[PDB]
Coordinates of C-alpha atoms and ligand atoms in Angstrom, one line a residue:
Chain P
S28 CA -9.1 -3.0 14.1
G29 CA -7.3 -5.0 11.4
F30 CA -3.7 -5.3 10.2
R31 CA -2.7 -4.1 6.5
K32 CA 0.2 -3.0 4.7
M33 CA -0.1 0.5 4.9
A34 CA 1.8 3.2 3.3
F35 CA 2.6 7.0 4.2
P36 CA 0.8 9.3 3.0
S37 CA 3.5 9.9 -0.5
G38 CA 1.6 14.1 -1.2
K39 CA 4.9 15.7 0.3
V40 CA 7.6 13.3 -1.9
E41 CA 4.8 14.0 -5.3
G42 CA 6.0 17.8 -5.4
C43 CA 9.2 16.4 -5.9
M44 CA 9.2 13.5 -8.6
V45 CA 10.5 15.9 -11.5
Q46 CA 11.8 13.9 -14.9
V47 CA 15.1 14.2 -16.0
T48 CA 16.3 13.1 -20.0
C49 CA 20.1 12.8 -21.3
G50 CA 19.7 11.2 -24.8
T51 CA 17.1 8.8 -25.5
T52 CA 17.3 7.5 -21.9
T53 CA 14.2 9.1 -19.9
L54 CA 14.2 8.4 -16.3
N55 CA 12.7 10.0 -12.9
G56 CA 14.6 12.1 -10.3
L57 CA 14.0 14.5 -7.2
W58 CA 13.6 18.0 -6.9
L59 CA 14.7 19.5 -3.4
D60 CA 15.7 23.3 -2.8
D61 CA 18.5 24.0 -6.5
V62 CA 19.4 20.2 -6.6
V63 CA 17.8 17.3 -8.8
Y64 CA 18.9 14.3 -7.7
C65 CA 19.0 11.2 -10.3
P66 CA 20.3 7.6 -11.2
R67 CA 23.4 8.2 -12.9
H68 CA 22.8 5.7 -16.0
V69 CA 21.3 8.5 -17.3
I70 CA 24.1 9.3 -19.5
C71 CA 24.5 5.9 -20.9
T72 CA 23.7 4.7 -24.0
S73 CA 22.5 1.3 -25.3
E74 CA 26.2 0.0 -25.5
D75 CA 27.5 1.5 -22.6
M76 CA 25.8 -0.3 -19.7
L77 CA 27.9 -3.6 -19.6
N78 CA 31.0 -1.5 -18.5
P79 CA 30.2 2.3 -18.5
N80 CA 33.3 4.4 -18.1
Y81 CA 30.5 6.7 -16.0
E82 CA 33.7 9.4 -15.8
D83 CA 34.6 10.0 -19.1
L84 CA 31.1 9.7 -20.6
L85 CA 29.9 12.7 -18.3
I86 CA 32.7 14.7 -19.6
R87 CA 31.2 14.9 -22.5
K88 CA 28.3 15.7 -21.2
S89 CA 27.7 19.5 -20.3
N90 CA 24.4 20.9 -18.8
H91 CA 22.4 21.7 -21.8
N92 CA 22.4 18.3 -22.7
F93 CA 20.7 17.2 -19.0
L94 CA 16.5 18.1 -20.0
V95 CA 15.1 18.5 -16.2
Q96 CA 11.0 19.2 -16.5
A97 CA 9.0 18.9 -13.2
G98 CA 5.9 18.1 -14.9
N99 CA 5.0 20.8 -17.7
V100 CA 7.8 23.5 -16.8
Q101 CA 11.2 23.5 -17.6
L102 CA 14.3 23.6 -15.6
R103 CA 17.5 25.6 -16.6
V104 CA 20.1 22.8 -15.4
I105 CA 22.7 25.4 -14.4
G106 CA 25.4 22.9 -12.9
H107 CA 26.2 19.0 -13.3
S108 CA 28.1 17.1 -10.8
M109 CA 28.5 13.0 -9.9
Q110 CA 28.5 11.8 -6.4
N111 CA 29.3 8.2 -5.8
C112 CA 26.2 6.4 -8.4
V113 CA 23.8 9.6 -8.7
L114 CA 23.9 13.2 -10.7
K115 CA 23.5 15.9 -9.0
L116 CA 22.1 19.2 -11.3
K117 CA 21.7 22.2 -10.2
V118 CA 19.3 24.5 -11.4
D119 CA 18.0 28.0 -11.0
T120 CA 15.4 27.1 -8.9
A121 CA 14.3 26.0 -5.9
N122 CA 11.3 23.5 -5.7
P123 CA 8.3 25.6 -4.2
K124 CA 7.5 22.3 -2.3
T125 CA 10.2 21.5 -1.2
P126 CA 9.4 19.1 2.3
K127 CA 11.3 19.5 5.4
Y128 CA 13.9 16.6 4.7
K129 CA 16.9 15.1 5.7
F130 CA 19.1 12.2 3.6
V131 CA 18.9 8.6 5.7
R132 CA 20.8 5.5 4.8
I133 CA 18.2 2.7 6.5
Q134 CA 19.4 -0.2 8.6
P135 CA 19.3 -4.1 7.5
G136 CA 15.8 -4.4 8.4
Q137 CA 14.0 -1.4 8.3
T138 CA 10.9 -0.3 5.9
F139 CA 9.9 2.6 3.5
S140 CA 7.2 3.5 1.4
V141 CA 7.9 3.4 -2.5
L142 CA 6.5 6.2 -4.7
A143 CA 6.7 4.3 -7.8
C144 CA 7.4 6.5 -10.6
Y145 CA 7.8 6.8 -14.6
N146 CA 8.4 9.8 -16.3
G147 CA 7.9 11.7 -13.0
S148 CA 4.7 11.4 -12.6
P149 CA 3.5 9.2 -9.9
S150 CA 1.4 5.9 -10.1
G151 CA 1.3 4.1 -6.9
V152 CA 2.6 3.7 -3.2
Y153 CA 3.2 0.7 -1.2
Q154 CA 5.2 -0.5 1.4
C155 CA 8.9 -2.4 0.9
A156 CA 11.2 -3.3 3.2
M157 CA 15.5 -3.6 3.1
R158 CA 16.2 -7.0 3.0
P159 CA 19.2 -8.6 4.9
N160 CA 20.9 -9.1 1.7
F161 CA 20.4 -5.2 1.0
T162 CA 17.8 -6.6 -2.0
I163 CA 13.5 -4.9 -2.2
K164 CA 10.9 -7.2 -3.6
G165 CA 8.9 -4.2 -5.1
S166 CA 7.0 -3.3 -8.5
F167 CA 9.7 -1.9 -11.1
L168 CA 9.2 -1.6 -14.7
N169 CA 11.6 0.0 -17.1
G170 CA 11.5 3.5 -16.3
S171 CA 11.3 3.3 -12.9
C172 CA 14.5 4.4 -11.4
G173 CA 14.8 7.1 -9.3
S174 CA 12.3 6.4 -7.8
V175 CA 12.9 7.2 -4.3
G176 CA 11.8 5.5 -0.6
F177 CA 11.4 7.7 2.3
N178 CA 9.4 7.6 5.9
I179 CA 8.1 10.4 7.2
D180 CA 8.0 11.0 11.2
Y181 CA 5.8 13.9 12.0
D182 CA 6.4 16.4 9.6
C183 CA 10.4 15.2 8.1
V184 CA 10.5 13.1 5.4
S185 CA 13.7 11.5 5.4
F186 CA 14.2 10.0 1.7
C187 CA 16.0 6.9 1.7
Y188 CA 16.3 4.8 -1.5
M189 CA 16.3 5.3 -5.6
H190 CA 15.3 2.3 -7.4
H191 CA 18.2 2.0 -9.5
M192 CA 18.5 -2.2 -11.2
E193 CA 16.3 -5.1 -11.2
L194 CA 18.9 -8.3 -10.4
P195 CA 18.9 -11.5 -12.0
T196 CA 16.0 -13.0 -9.3
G197 CA 13.6 -10.3 -9.9
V198 CA 14.6 -8.5 -6.9
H199 CA 15.7 -4.9 -7.2
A200 CA 18.7 -2.7 -5.8
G201 CA 19.0 0.8 -5.1
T202 CA 21.3 3.6 -3.3
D203 CA 20.6 5.9 -0.6
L204 CA 20.4 9.8 -1.8
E205 CA 24.2 10.0 -1.4
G206 CA 24.6 7.6 -4.3
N207 CA 25.6 4.3 -2.4
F208 CA 24.5 1.4 -3.2
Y209 CA 23.0 -0.6 -0.8
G210 CA 24.5 -3.9 -0.9
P211 CA 27.0 -5.7 -3.2
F212 CA 26.1 -3.9 -6.1
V213 CA 27.4 -1.8 -8.7
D214 CA 24.8 0.1 -11.7
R215 CA 26.0 -1.9 -14.7
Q216 CA 23.5 -4.4 -16.4
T217 CA 25.9 -7.6 -14.9
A218 CA 24.7 -10.9 -13.5
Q219 CA 25.1 -9.8 -9.7
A220 CA 24.5 -12.3 -7.1
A221 CA 22.0 -11.1 -4.1
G222 CA 23.0 -13.2 -0.7
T223 CA 21.6 -15.9 0.8
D224 CA 18.9 -13.7 2.1
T225 CA 17.4 -14.3 5.8
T226 CA 14.2 -13.9 7.6
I227 CA 13.7 -10.7 10.0
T228 CA 12.8 -11.9 13.0
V229 CA 11.7 -9.3 15.3
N230 CA 9.6 -8.4 12.5
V231 CA 8.3 -11.7 12.5
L232 CA 7.8 -11.8 15.6
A233 CA 6.4 -8.8 16.0
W234 CA 3.5 -8.9 13.1
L235 CA 2.9 -12.7 15.5
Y236 CA 2.3 -9.8 18.4
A237 CA -0.6 -7.9 16.4
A238 CA -2.1 -11.3 15.4
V239 CA -2.9 -11.4 19.3
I240 CA -4.0 -8.0 19.2
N241 CA -6.2 -8.4 16.5
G242 CA -7.9 -11.7 17.1
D243 CA -5.6 -14.6 16.0
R244 CA -4.4 -16.2 18.8
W245 CA -4.6 -20.0 17.6
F246 CA -0.1 -19.6 17.7
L247 CA 0.1 -18.9 21.4
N248 CA 0.7 -21.9 23.1
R249 CA 1.8 -23.3 26.5
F250 CA 5.6 -23.9 25.9
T251 CA 8.5 -21.6 26.5
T252 CA 12.6 -21.6 25.0
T253 CA 15.5 -20.4 25.9
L254 CA 16.8 -16.8 23.4
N255 CA 19.8 -19.3 22.2
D256 CA 17.1 -22.6 21.5
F257 CA 14.9 -20.2 19.5
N258 CA 18.2 -19.1 17.7
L259 CA 19.0 -22.7 16.9
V260 CA 15.7 -23.4 15.7
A261 CA 16.5 -20.1 13.5
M262 CA 20.0 -20.9 12.0
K263 CA 17.9 -24.4 10.4
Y264 CA 15.6 -22.3 9.2
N265 CA 17.4 -19.4 8.2
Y266 CA 16.1 -16.8 10.2
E267 CA 17.8 -13.7 11.6
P268 CA 19.7 -14.5 15.0
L269 CA 17.8 -13.2 17.6
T270 CA 19.7 -10.6 20.1
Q271 CA 19.0 -9.1 23.5
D272 CA 18.2 -5.9 21.4
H273 CA 14.9 -7.0 19.5
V274 CA 13.7 -8.3 22.8
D275 CA 14.0 -4.9 24.3
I276 CA 12.7 -3.4 20.9
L277 CA 9.9 -5.5 21.6
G278 CA 9.0 -4.6 24.8
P279 CA 6.2 -1.9 24.4
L280 CA 4.4 -4.8 22.1
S281 CA 5.4 -7.1 24.5
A282 CA 3.9 -5.1 27.9
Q283 CA 0.3 -4.2 25.9
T284 CA -0.1 -7.5 25.6
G285 CA 1.4 -9.4 28.6
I286 CA 3.0 -11.5 26.5
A287 CA 6.7 -12.4 26.9
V288 CA 9.1 -12.3 24.0
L289 CA 10.7 -15.8 24.9
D290 CA 7.1 -17.0 25.0
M291 CA 6.0 -15.7 21.6
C292 CA 9.4 -17.3 20.5
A293 CA 8.1 -20.6 21.5
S294 CA 5.0 -20.1 19.5
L295 CA 7.0 -19.2 16.6
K296 CA 9.4 -22.2 16.9
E297 CA 6.8 -23.8 16.6
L298 CA 5.1 -22.6 14.0
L299 CA 8.2 -23.1 12.0
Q300 CA 8.4 -27.0 12.9
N301 CA 5.1 -27.8 12.6
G302 CA 3.7 -25.5 9.9
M303 CA 0.7 -23.8 9.5
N304 CA -1.6 -26.7 8.9
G305 CA -3.5 -24.2 6.8
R306 CA -4.5 -21.7 9.0
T307 CA -4.3 -18.0 8.4
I308 CA -2.4 -15.5 10.9
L309 CA -3.8 -12.2 10.3
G310 CA -5.0 -13.2 6.7
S311 CA -1.5 -14.6 5.5
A312 CA -0.7 -18.3 5.3
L313 CA 2.7 -17.4 5.5
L314 CA 5.0 -15.7 8.2
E315 CA 5.4 -12.1 7.2
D316 CA 8.9 -10.3 8.1
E317 CA 8.3 -7.0 6.9
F318 CA 6.3 -5.2 9.4
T319 CA 9.1 -3.5 12.1
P320 CA 7.9 -3.4 15.8
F321 CA 7.3 0.6 14.9
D322 CA 5.1 -0.3 11.9
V323 CA 3.6 -2.7 14.6
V324 CA 3.0 0.5 17.4
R325 CA 1.9 2.8 14.6
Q326 CA -1.2 1.4 13.1
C327 CA -2.0 0.3 16.4
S328 CA -1.7 3.6 17.8
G329 CA -3.7 5.4 15.4
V330 CA -0.3 7.6 14.5
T331 CA -1.0 10.7 12.4
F332 CA 2.0 12.0 10.1
Chain X
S11 CA 9.3 -6.8 -12.9
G12 CA 7.3 -7.9 -9.2
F13 CA 3.2 -7.3 -8.5
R14 CA 2.6 -5.5 -5.1
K15 CA -0.7 -4.5 -3.8
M16 CA -0.4 -1.0 -4.8
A17 CA -2.6 2.5 -4.1
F18 CA -2.7 5.3 -5.7
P19 CA -1.0 8.8 -5.4
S20 CA -2.8 10.3 -2.2
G21 CA -1.4 13.6 -2.8
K22 CA -4.8 15.1 -4.0
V23 CA -7.0 13.7 -1.9
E24 CA -4.6 14.3 1.1
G25 CA -5.5 18.2 0.6
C26 CA -9.3 17.9 1.3
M27 CA -8.6 16.1 4.5
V28 CA -10.3 18.2 7.4
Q29 CA -11.6 17.4 10.7
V30 CA -14.9 17.9 12.1
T31 CA -16.0 18.1 15.7
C32 CA -19.6 18.2 17.0
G33 CA -19.8 17.6 20.9
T34 CA -17.1 14.9 22.4
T35 CA -17.2 12.9 19.0
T36 CA -14.1 14.1 16.7
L37 CA -13.9 12.4 13.1
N38 CA -12.6 13.1 10.0
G39 CA -13.6 15.2 6.6
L40 CA -13.5 15.5 3.3
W41 CA -13.9 19.4 1.7
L42 CA -14.7 19.9 -1.8
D43 CA -15.5 23.4 -3.0
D44 CA -17.7 24.8 -0.2
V45 CA -18.7 21.3 1.1
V46 CA -17.6 19.2 4.1
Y47 CA -18.7 15.7 4.1
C48 CA -18.7 13.8 7.0
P49 CA -20.0 10.9 8.9
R50 CA -23.3 11.4 10.5
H51 CA -22.9 9.9 13.7
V52 CA -20.2 13.0 14.9
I53 CA -24.0 14.1 15.9
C54 CA -24.7 11.3 18.6
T55 CA -23.5 11.0 22.2
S56 CA -22.3 8.3 24.3
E57 CA -25.9 7.0 25.0
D58 CA -27.3 7.6 21.3
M59 CA -25.6 5.0 19.2
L60 CA -28.0 1.9 19.4
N61 CA -30.7 3.8 18.2
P62 CA -30.2 7.1 17.2
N63 CA -33.1 9.3 16.1
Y64 CA -30.5 11.6 13.5
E65 CA -33.4 13.6 12.9
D66 CA -34.2 15.1 16.3
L67 CA -30.7 15.0 17.1
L68 CA -29.9 17.4 14.5
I69 CA -32.8 19.7 15.3
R70 CA -31.0 20.8 17.9
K71 CA -27.9 20.9 16.4
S72 CA -27.3 24.3 14.3
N73 CA -23.9 25.7 12.0
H74 CA -22.1 27.1 14.8
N75 CA -22.1 23.5 17.1
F76 CA -19.8 22.1 14.2
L77 CA -16.5 22.4 14.1
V78 CA -14.1 22.4 11.0
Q79 CA -10.5 22.8 11.1
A80 CA -8.9 22.2 7.8
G81 CA -5.2 22.0 9.6
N82 CA -5.0 24.8 11.7
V83 CA -7.6 27.3 9.9
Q84 CA -11.1 26.8 11.3
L85 CA -13.6 27.2 8.6
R86 CA -16.9 29.4 9.1
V87 CA -19.8 26.8 9.3
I88 CA -23.0 28.6 7.3
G89 CA -24.9 25.6 6.3
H90 CA -25.8 22.3 7.2
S91 CA -28.1 19.4 5.9
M92 CA -28.3 15.5 6.1
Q93 CA -28.2 13.5 2.8
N94 CA -28.8 10.0 3.9
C95 CA -26.1 8.9 6.4
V96 CA -23.8 11.7 5.8
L97 CA -23.7 15.2 7.2
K98 CA -23.0 18.1 4.1
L99 CA -21.5 20.9 5.6
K100 CA -21.5 24.3 4.0
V101 CA -18.7 26.7 4.7
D102 CA -17.6 30.2 3.7
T103 CA -14.5 29.0 1.7
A104 CA -13.9 26.4 -0.8
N105 CA -10.7 24.5 -0.7
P106 CA -7.6 26.0 -3.0
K107 CA -6.6 22.2 -3.3
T108 CA -9.6 20.8 -4.8
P109 CA -9.3 18.0 -7.2
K110 CA -11.1 17.6 -10.8
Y111 CA -13.6 15.0 -8.8
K112 CA -16.4 12.7 -9.3
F113 CA -18.8 10.7 -6.5
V114 CA -19.6 7.4 -7.8
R115 CA -20.8 4.0 -6.5
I116 CA -18.3 1.7 -7.2
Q117 CA -19.5 -2.5 -8.1
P118 CA -19.0 -5.1 -5.8
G119 CA -16.2 -6.4 -6.9
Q120 CA -14.0 -3.2 -7.9
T121 CA -11.1 -2.5 -5.7
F122 CA -10.2 1.3 -4.1
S123 CA -7.5 3.1 -2.5
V124 CA -7.7 4.3 1.2
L125 CA -6.0 7.2 3.1
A126 CA -6.4 6.2 6.5
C127 CA -7.2 9.7 8.9
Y128 CA -7.0 10.2 12.0
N129 CA -8.2 13.9 13.4
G130 CA -7.8 14.8 10.0
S131 CA -4.4 14.0 9.1
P132 CA -3.4 11.4 6.8
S133 CA -1.4 8.6 8.0
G134 CA -1.1 6.7 5.2
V135 CA -2.4 4.4 2.2
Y136 CA -3.4 1.1 1.4
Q137 CA -5.6 -0.7 -1.9
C138 CA -8.8 -1.9 -0.8
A139 CA -11.7 -3.9 -2.6
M140 CA -15.5 -4.1 -1.9
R141 CA -16.1 -7.4 -1.3
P142 CA -19.1 -9.4 -2.7
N143 CA -20.6 -9.0 0.9
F144 CA -20.1 -4.8 0.3
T145 CA -17.5 -5.3 3.3
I146 CA -13.6 -4.2 3.2
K147 CA -10.9 -5.9 5.4
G148 CA -8.8 -2.8 5.9
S149 CA -7.0 -1.0 9.0
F150 CA -9.4 1.3 11.0
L151 CA -9.2 2.4 14.8
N152 CA -11.9 4.7 16.4
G153 CA -11.1 7.7 14.6
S154 CA -10.7 6.4 11.3
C155 CA -14.4 7.3 10.2
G156 CA -14.0 9.9 7.5
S157 CA -11.3 8.5 5.8
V158 CA -12.9 8.3 1.8
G159 CA -11.8 5.9 -0.4
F160 CA -11.0 6.7 -4.3
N161 CA -9.5 6.1 -7.1
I162 CA -7.6 8.1 -9.3
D163 CA -8.0 8.4 -13.2
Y164 CA -5.5 10.0 -15.1
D165 CA -6.5 13.1 -13.6
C166 CA -9.8 12.7 -11.7
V167 CA -10.4 11.9 -8.6
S168 CA -13.5 9.5 -8.2
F169 CA -14.3 9.3 -4.4
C170 CA -16.0 6.2 -3.8
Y171 CA -16.3 5.5 -0.3
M172 CA -16.1 6.6 3.6
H173 CA -15.7 4.6 6.3
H174 CA -18.8 4.5 9.1
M175 CA -18.3 1.4 11.0
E176 CA -16.6 -1.6 12.2
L177 CA -18.6 -4.8 12.1
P178 CA -18.7 -8.5 14.6
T179 CA -16.9 -10.0 12.0
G180 CA -14.0 -7.9 12.5
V181 CA -13.9 -6.2 8.5
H182 CA -15.8 -2.6 7.7
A183 CA -18.5 -1.1 6.7
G184 CA -18.6 2.3 4.7
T185 CA -20.9 4.8 2.3
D186 CA -20.4 6.0 -0.7
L187 CA -20.2 10.2 -1.1
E188 CA -23.5 10.2 -1.0
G189 CA -24.5 8.5 2.3
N190 CA -26.0 5.0 0.8
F191 CA -24.9 2.5 3.1
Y192 CA -22.9 -0.1 0.9
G193 CA -24.7 -3.3 1.9
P194 CA -27.3 -3.9 4.4
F195 CA -25.9 -2.0 7.2
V196 CA -27.2 0.8 9.3
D197 CA -25.0 3.5 11.5
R198 CA -25.9 2.3 14.6
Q199 CA -23.8 0.4 17.3
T200 CA -25.9 -2.7 16.9
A201 CA -24.6 -6.5 16.1
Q202 CA -25.1 -6.6 11.9
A203 CA -24.5 -9.4 9.6
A204 CA -22.0 -9.9 7.1
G205 CA -23.4 -12.3 4.1
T206 CA -21.7 -15.2 3.4
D207 CA -19.0 -14.1 1.5
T208 CA -17.7 -15.1 -1.8
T209 CA -14.5 -15.2 -3.6
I210 CA -14.0 -12.7 -6.5
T211 CA -13.0 -15.3 -9.5
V212 CA -12.3 -12.8 -12.2
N213 CA -9.6 -11.3 -9.9
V214 CA -8.5 -14.6 -8.6
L215 CA -8.0 -15.0 -12.5
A216 CA -6.0 -12.2 -12.9
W217 CA -3.6 -12.6 -10.4
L218 CA -2.9 -15.8 -11.7
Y219 CA -2.6 -14.5 -14.7
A220 CA 0.1 -12.1 -13.6
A221 CA 2.3 -14.9 -11.9
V222 CA 2.4 -15.9 -15.8
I223 CA 3.6 -12.7 -16.9
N224 CA 6.4 -12.2 -13.8
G225 CA 7.4 -15.8 -13.8
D226 CA 5.6 -18.3 -11.7
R227 CA 4.3 -20.5 -13.8
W228 CA 3.6 -23.9 -12.0
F229 CA 0.3 -23.5 -11.8
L230 CA -0.2 -23.6 -15.3
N231 CA -1.5 -27.6 -16.7
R232 CA -1.9 -29.3 -20.1
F233 CA -5.7 -29.8 -18.8
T234 CA -8.9 -27.8 -20.1
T235 CA -12.1 -27.3 -18.7
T236 CA -16.0 -25.4 -19.6
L237 CA -17.4 -22.3 -17.9
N238 CA -20.1 -24.5 -16.6
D239 CA -17.5 -27.1 -14.9
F240 CA -15.5 -24.4 -13.2
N241 CA -18.6 -22.9 -12.1
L242 CA -19.4 -26.5 -10.4
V243 CA -16.1 -26.5 -9.1
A244 CA -16.9 -22.4 -7.7
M245 CA -19.8 -23.2 -6.7
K246 CA -18.6 -25.8 -4.3
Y247 CA -15.7 -23.7 -3.1
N248 CA -17.9 -20.6 -2.7
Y249 CA -16.4 -18.8 -5.7
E250 CA -18.2 -15.9 -7.4
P251 CA -20.2 -18.1 -10.9
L252 CA -18.1 -16.8 -14.0
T253 CA -20.0 -15.0 -16.6
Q254 CA -18.6 -14.5 -20.4
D255 CA -18.3 -11.0 -19.9
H256 CA -15.6 -11.8 -17.3
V257 CA -14.2 -13.4 -20.2
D258 CA -14.4 -10.8 -22.1
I259 CA -12.6 -8.6 -19.5
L260 CA -9.7 -10.7 -18.9
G261 CA -9.3 -10.7 -22.7
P262 CA -6.9 -8.2 -23.0
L263 CA -4.4 -9.9 -20.7
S264 CA -5.1 -13.2 -22.4
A265 CA -3.3 -12.4 -25.2
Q266 CA -0.6 -10.8 -23.8
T267 CA 0.3 -14.1 -22.3
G268 CA -1.4 -16.8 -25.1
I269 CA -3.1 -18.4 -22.8
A270 CA -6.8 -19.1 -22.7
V271 CA -9.0 -18.2 -20.1
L272 CA -10.7 -21.2 -19.7
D273 CA -7.0 -23.0 -19.6
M274 CA -6.4 -20.6 -16.9
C275 CA -9.6 -21.8 -15.2
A276 CA -8.3 -25.6 -15.9
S277 CA -5.3 -24.3 -13.3
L278 CA -7.5 -22.6 -11.4
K279 CA -10.0 -25.6 -11.4
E280 CA -7.0 -27.5 -10.0
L281 CA -5.7 -25.2 -6.9
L282 CA -8.9 -25.0 -5.5
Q283 CA -9.3 -29.3 -5.8
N284 CA -5.5 -29.7 -4.8
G285 CA -4.8 -26.6 -2.5
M286 CA -1.4 -25.2 -2.8
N287 CA 1.2 -28.2 -2.1
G288 CA 3.2 -25.7 0.2
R289 CA 4.1 -23.7 -3.0
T290 CA 3.5 -20.0 -3.1
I291 CA 2.2 -17.9 -6.3
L292 CA 3.7 -14.3 -6.5
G293 CA 4.8 -14.4 -3.2
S294 CA 1.5 -15.6 -1.4
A295 CA 0.4 -18.9 -0.2
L296 CA -3.1 -18.3 -0.6
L297 CA -5.3 -17.3 -3.5
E298 CA -5.4 -13.6 -4.1
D299 CA -8.3 -11.8 -5.3
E300 CA -8.1 -8.4 -4.8
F301 CA -6.6 -7.8 -8.0
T302 CA -8.7 -6.6 -10.4
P303 CA -7.9 -7.5 -14.7
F304 CA -7.3 -3.4 -14.6
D305 CA -5.4 -3.5 -11.1
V306 CA -2.7 -6.1 -14.0
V307 CA -3.1 -4.6 -16.8
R308 CA -2.1 -1.4 -15.2
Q309 CA 0.9 -2.7 -12.8
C310 CA 2.3 -3.9 -16.1
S311 CA 2.0 -1.3 -18.1
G312 CA 3.0 1.5 -16.3
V313 CA 0.8 3.7 -15.5
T314 CA 1.0 7.0 -14.1
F315 CA -1.9 9.3 -13.0
Ligands
LIG414 CL1 0.0 -15.6 1.9

């Protein structure tokens, strides 16, 4: 029993964590086959970051200006290129430990695991989620850029994130592994605006579905509701509008528990209106929306990757 | 910035996760050099678990009855032995990926990371803590026995836990890697009693110290206190009594923040007496005691293992 914030096993991605240094700025990289993917603001100086002309700055750099080291071995950088907001550094060697992998642009609301790294050296792992406003609330210090997010399905590591910056709000922003920023964010140390975040409704209902499976059943009520009436309570509380596709995604869970989705929506409706009353569901005095219905089926199924 | 529940990089321990099967019961193992350490209730049947005579049961087993497989390769079990509540199975081979390691019996209150495994296949990782009553609140399903807890310091993997059973309370119990159960628990499917747990005080004060470093400063007050008066508020709320050694351990943090320990104890004292008032500290509406003062210095220092 028990529901905890679980993260995918990090070993496969650890082997690909390298260190890239251009000038004084040193950040992390990801070595898959003969390319080392790193954030492109490695080429900026201390006075370039408010508005860098990344093109001209890179035109001054050559291959030998980039210093890639996969731990203690140094890699001969034989090509350099810029895709969007990342640098793709061809190298003479292919990572012997290159996992079977795929690059993916996850949809807002889907969860992944971060291997927070500093100087190419893995430090630890934790599960973060792409918020509706394309931000992630994680744990990053200066030198964490390049730390990639990822999922693991059976044997494939589907990389989906790379940390780039910390926003004024305290949350963080990154790109996919093609360099396209999640959200409206650009890699320049400017005051950027993270939109009014919302609360992933399909994920709070799935974490409540988990509590029922793990003993916490006090929220379950006699009431019911309509999909539109819970969406009127939702809009008040700045929750994500619920669709029929959410109901169908939460179906497998709704059957293992025998509770209808719209019934669980009444129990949710009534937790928002009357609060928590000092009680705890699955160990939290708040409502948790960082578990997708797959994370709930997975931990309550004993999946192995 | 940001404080998240981080877990050590799992790669080094993943290579040592194997599968041990005796009869129908299949559980996980840990392969370090030429020994495979697994929970000893692998030898029990469906009608042996209320009160197994582990000695006689093992006397009927031989080496060939144990079926160890490190993934797809099968290991020739050449010796079998019982240390306390674990089985130590000598094998013809040494794990090529055996990390530098040490077995450790952690003290109640210290934290470690669990690589929850099923059928020898790592599933995911998360940070758990040995509660004052020698229980751990984690995420375990049938088949998770053998999942080892561990810490990583620079390069050494200091294994400290192995999951054995789920208690009636819903929490879980395990052993060190010598087989000695943490707590009063015996490996027999009986109704066992987890003592009245307490709240790790040195760890709530360190997670509050973290909030100050990461922006949350509303709990900080003008009041102060004595070490004995906060221990009288502590005993009321079933918190762990605070000692001078706790104060000295929280010293490095108290200096980076400029706030005295006993001052933070007044802010704590006043969160217990008047509650949280619906506010959140570092993202939780409760008080978190699963971060040791090292976990706070580590995440706010960018350590790399
Ligand atoms: Cl909480």
